[PDB]
Amino acid sequence: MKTQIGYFASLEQYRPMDALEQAIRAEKVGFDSVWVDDHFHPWYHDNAQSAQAWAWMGAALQATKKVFISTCITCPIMRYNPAIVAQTFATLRQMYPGRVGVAVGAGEAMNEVPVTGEWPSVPVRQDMTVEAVKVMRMLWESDKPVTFKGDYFTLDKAFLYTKPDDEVPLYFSGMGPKGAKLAGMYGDHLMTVAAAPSTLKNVTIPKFEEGAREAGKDPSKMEHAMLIWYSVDPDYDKAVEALRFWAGCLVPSMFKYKVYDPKEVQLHANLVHCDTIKENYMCATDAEEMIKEIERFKEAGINHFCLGNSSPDVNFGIDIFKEVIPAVRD
Amino acid sequence: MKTQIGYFASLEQYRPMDALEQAIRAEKVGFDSVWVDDHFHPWYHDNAQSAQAWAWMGAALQATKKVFISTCITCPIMRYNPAIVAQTFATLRQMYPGRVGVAVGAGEAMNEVPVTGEWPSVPVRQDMTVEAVKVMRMLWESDKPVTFKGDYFTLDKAFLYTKPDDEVPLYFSGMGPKGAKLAGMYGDHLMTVAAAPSTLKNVTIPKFEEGAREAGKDPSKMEHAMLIWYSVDPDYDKAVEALRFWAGCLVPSMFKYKVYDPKEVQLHANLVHCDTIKENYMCATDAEEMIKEIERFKEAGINHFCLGNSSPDVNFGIDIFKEVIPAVRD
Numbered sequence: 001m002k003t004q005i006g007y008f009a010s011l012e013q014y015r016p017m018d019a020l021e022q023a024i025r026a027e028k029v030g031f032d033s034v035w036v037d038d039h040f041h042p043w044y045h046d047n048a049q050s051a052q053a054w055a056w057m058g059a060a061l062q063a064t065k066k067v068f069i070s071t072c073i074t075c076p077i078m079r080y081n082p083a084i085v086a087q088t089f090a091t092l093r094q095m096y097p098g099r100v101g102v103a104v105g106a107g108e109a110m111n112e113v114p115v116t117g118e119w120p121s122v123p124v125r126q127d128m129t130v131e132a133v134k135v136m137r138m139l140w141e142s143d144k145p146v147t148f149k150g151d152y153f154t155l156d157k158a159f160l161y162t163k164p165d166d167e168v169p170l171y172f173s174g175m176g177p178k179g180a181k182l183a184g185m186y187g188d189h190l191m192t193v194a195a196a197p198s199t200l201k202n203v204t205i206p207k208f209e210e211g212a213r214e215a216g217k218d219p220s221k222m223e224h225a226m227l228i229w230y231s232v233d234p235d236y237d238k239a240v241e242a243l244r245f246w247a248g249c250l251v252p253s254m255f256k257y258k259v260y261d262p263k264e265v266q267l268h269a270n271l272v273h274c275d276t277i278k279e280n281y282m283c284a285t286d287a288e289e290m291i292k293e294i295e296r297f298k299e300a301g302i303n304h305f306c307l308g309n310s311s312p313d314v315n316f317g318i319d320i321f322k323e324v325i326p327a328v329r330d
Numbered sequence: 331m332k333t334q335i336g337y338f339a340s341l342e343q344y345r346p347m348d349a350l351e352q353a354i355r356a357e358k359v360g361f362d363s364v365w366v367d368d369h370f371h372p373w374y375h376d377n378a379q380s381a382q383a384w385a386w387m388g389a390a391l392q393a394t395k396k397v398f399i400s401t402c403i404t405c406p407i408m409r410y411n412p413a414i415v416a417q418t419f420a421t422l423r424q425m426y427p428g429r430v431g432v433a434v435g436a437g438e439a440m441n442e443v444p445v446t447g448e449w450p451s452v453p454v455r456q457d458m459t460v461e462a463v464k465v466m467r468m469l470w471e472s473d474k475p476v477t478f479k480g481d482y483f484t485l486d487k488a489f490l491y492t493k494p495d496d497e498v499p500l501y502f503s504g505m506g507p508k509g510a511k512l513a514g515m516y517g518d519h520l521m522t523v524a525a526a527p528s529t530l531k532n533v534t535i536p537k538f539e540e541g542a543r544e545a546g547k548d549p550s551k552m553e554h555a556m557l558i559w560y561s562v563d564p565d566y567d568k569a570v571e572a573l574r575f576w577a578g579c580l581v582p583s584m585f586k587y588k589v590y591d592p593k594e595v596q597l598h599a600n601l602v603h604c605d606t607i608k609e610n611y612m613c614a615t616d617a618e619e620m621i622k623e624i625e626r627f628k629e630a631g632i633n634h635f636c637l638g639n640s641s642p643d644v645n646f647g648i649d650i651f652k653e654v655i656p657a658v659r660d
């Protein structure tokens with residue numbers, strides 16, 4: 001599996017047009033792909049945004065030339081109807097052949113609760129996510145209308161009239177052992193986040209491959225993608241503090257509990273310890289340290305990086321990759 | 331009220347990239363705005379598409395320079411969550427200041443049923459549409475999180491972190507007398523379709539203005555927009571037959587009954603009489619006839635045209651407007 005280096009352009013940390021400009025610059029510097037978060041409420045309250053990802057993606061695909069672009073990730077089970085998610089990405093891939101993907105996952109209360117008032121348990125959301133993926137695949141792959149009455153979703157003589165030449169690649173998010181195994185069973189590739197290399201090497205990747213083998217798949221053709229935030233600045237302290245915005249992602253309960261007010265998510269983010277940030281995220285003072293940070297995750301099994309630029313000087317955070325990319329391979 | 335002439339680029343009759351190219355050409359020829367249908371299933375089965383409109387709009391706004399672009403129309407009550415519709419258009423308007431609008435309406439079974447299995451009555455859907463508009467406005471206009479428990483929709487400490495400089499203009503569709511009055515009460519402007527000038531002059535516009543006055547609004551600042559399909563070709567018979575794809579829109583029951591299979595919608599479309607098509611749509615052999623067709627609708631009260639090009643020669647159907655636009659005024 002070849003190493004791909006992608007850029008995560010946040011619609012929570014930056015205004016959407018600013019994120020679009022970052023994506024264009026990332027492509028020029030040499031990133032292979034661009035990834036974007038799909039949120040309704042942000043992980044932090046102060047100076048935050050939460051732009052709609054699908055509308056932004058149409059603009060980004062049109063503004064760029066060749067990079068692959070995918071969400072990271074799109075929860076297809078509550079505020080979004082899975083058939084509509086299937087239609088959206090099939091449409092974009094027909095418009096921009098070979099440049100479009102989608103990633104899915106069980107959700108976060110901060111996006112789903114504010115607009116539905118509901119929050120089911122983790123096993124129920126995982127179950128809903130598997131059924132959503134089934135719905136998406138039926139629509140992407142069927143040559144005739146399909147009727148389906150699942151436990152959560154319904155299709156009634158549904159057909160996708162707009163399909164791409166080849167199927168949209170589907171990344172499935174798994175953070176815990178059960179989620180990772182489900183990703184191997186139902187996704188084309190793994191997507192993960194907020195894990196230290198040890199967890200990846202010993203739990204996440206092994207469980208993902210176990211799920212793939214149980215389903216009769218060759219895990220060797222399945223990418224291991226991961227969202228990791230980085231901050232690079234000559235002043236180490238300034239670089240580490242600049243990652244504060246994303247500290248809440250390192251609090252496991254934020255992915256399970258019914259917490260959806262960004263002000264309270266921010267309180268938790270502000271309680272995260274500096275060593276937790278340095279252990280999970282990439283804090284670097286120069287290109288050499290960034291290369292080594294990436295290499296420790298490569299050694300753990302990651303081969304498609306989705307790197308979220310949370311650097312004090314955003315443009316430098318992108319530019320410095322002219323030195324990083326060739327050294328890590330792509 | 332000044333007359334504006336817009337172009338309706340269909341994602342049902344054309345592939346999405348083809349519709350994008352038409353939009354770019356329309357802007358160059360002089361159209362003031364571009365409108366796009368928001369469907370899951372198409373009005374006709376043969377050679378049809380149904381691309382997702384929001385993703386397409388991000389691409390079209392990025393590819394064009396100044397035209398105003400809006401959906402025509404987006405049903406915000408079942409397959410789409412109204413808070414998400416509110417987020418999508420607020421995001422696009424923040425990215426493309428002053429160039430984005432949205433139109434809403436009660437829906438069509440062909441879009442909502444295939445992905446939900448449900449189809450409420452007209453009065454219930456109208457009621458849901460009014461509550462959806464309330465949800466959208468609360469989110470667009472509030473400076474603090476809002477909590478709302480309506481009959482159909484829920485907001486729980488919801489806040490739009492990404493807002494444009496000024497509010498998204500909202501077109502409200504009304505076809506029947508009650509819908510037209512609701513449009514005057516709750517929309518910023520009227521959107522309508524499938525009506526002859528007499529109906530417009532005597533029922534639709536009067537009811538819309540009645541609704542606006544009841545709500546305390548000045549109807550004089552509210553546009554009267556309408557989607558009308560046209561076909562222009564030197565051979566009149568060829569021009570009229572080219573409108574077949576859209577004949578189903580002239581069958582009132584298609585907006586009320588639970589009919590969602592495009593093959594059966596097509597059967598009905600194929601039973602529509604030629605005089606019905608000539609009376610409601612614009613069939614012309616040259617620029618002069620197009621100008622007179624537009625003038626008869628202007629006289630009935632329409633001042634923002636959304637013209638759907640269903641001409642045999644699509645490019646000529648756009649180009650000929652270099653001669654039409656200056657004569658009808660914009």
Ligand SMILES: CC(=O)Cc1c2c(=O)[nH]c(=O)nc-2n(C[C@H](O)[C@H](O)[C@H](O)COP(=O)(O)O[C@@H](C)C(=O)N[C@@H](CCC(=O)N[C@@H](CCC(=O)O)C(=O)O)C(=O)O)c2cc(O)ccc12
Nearest residue numbers: 037038072073075105107173175176177178179191192193
């Ligand atoms: C920027 C960002 O938010 C990340 C991006 C997301 C986004 O933009 N939008 C969005 O909606 N979601 C995003 N996600 C997260 C994703 O939606 C979803 O939350 C995760 O895929 C969930 O992973 P999972 O299915 O593995 O479930 C988690 C919660 C898990 O841990 N499950 C385990 C079972 C529960 C458990 O952990 N409890 C244990 C105790 C643990 C303890 O002691 O603390 C117990 O029961 O014993 C399990 O085993 O599966 C993502 C996601 C990725 O990957 C990348 C970008 C975004």
Ligand SMILES: CC(=O)Cc1c2c(=O)[nH]c(=O)nc-2n(C[C@H](O)[C@H](O)[C@H](O)COP(=O)(O)O[C@@H](C)C(=O)N[C@@H](CCC(=O)N[C@@H](CCC(=O)O)C(=O)O)C(=O)O)c2cc(O)ccc12
Nearest residue numbers: 367368402403405435437503505506507508509521522523
């Ligand atoms: C290309 C296209 O489909 C048009 C575009 C639409 C789109 O792209 N997507 C979409 O989801 N919808 C589109 N619509 C239609 C819109 O969603 C919606 O169907 C209309 O706004 C509904 O109008 P309305 O609220 O006025 O309701 C109609 C059905 C109406 O007639 N209501 C009346 C009451 C019922 C009635 O007619 N029955 C009468 C008997 C009549 C008889 O004898 O036949 C009775 O009860 O006595 C009423 O009074 O309100 C649109 C819409 C527009 O405007 C533009 C583009 C699209």
Ligand SMILES: [Cl-]
Nearest residue numbers: 013014015018
């Ligand atoms: Cl910004």
Ligand SMILES: [Cl-]
Nearest residue numbers: 010308309310
């Ligand atoms: Cl970021």
Ligand SMILES: [Cl-]
Nearest residue numbers: 343344345348
């Ligand atoms: Cl086409």
Ligand SMILES: [Cl-]
Nearest residue numbers: 340638639640
């Ligand atoms: Cl058309």
Ligand SMILES: [K+]
Nearest residue numbers: 097098165166
């Ligand atoms: K393709």
Ligand SMILES: [K+]
Nearest residue numbers: 427428495496
């Ligand atoms: K604006």
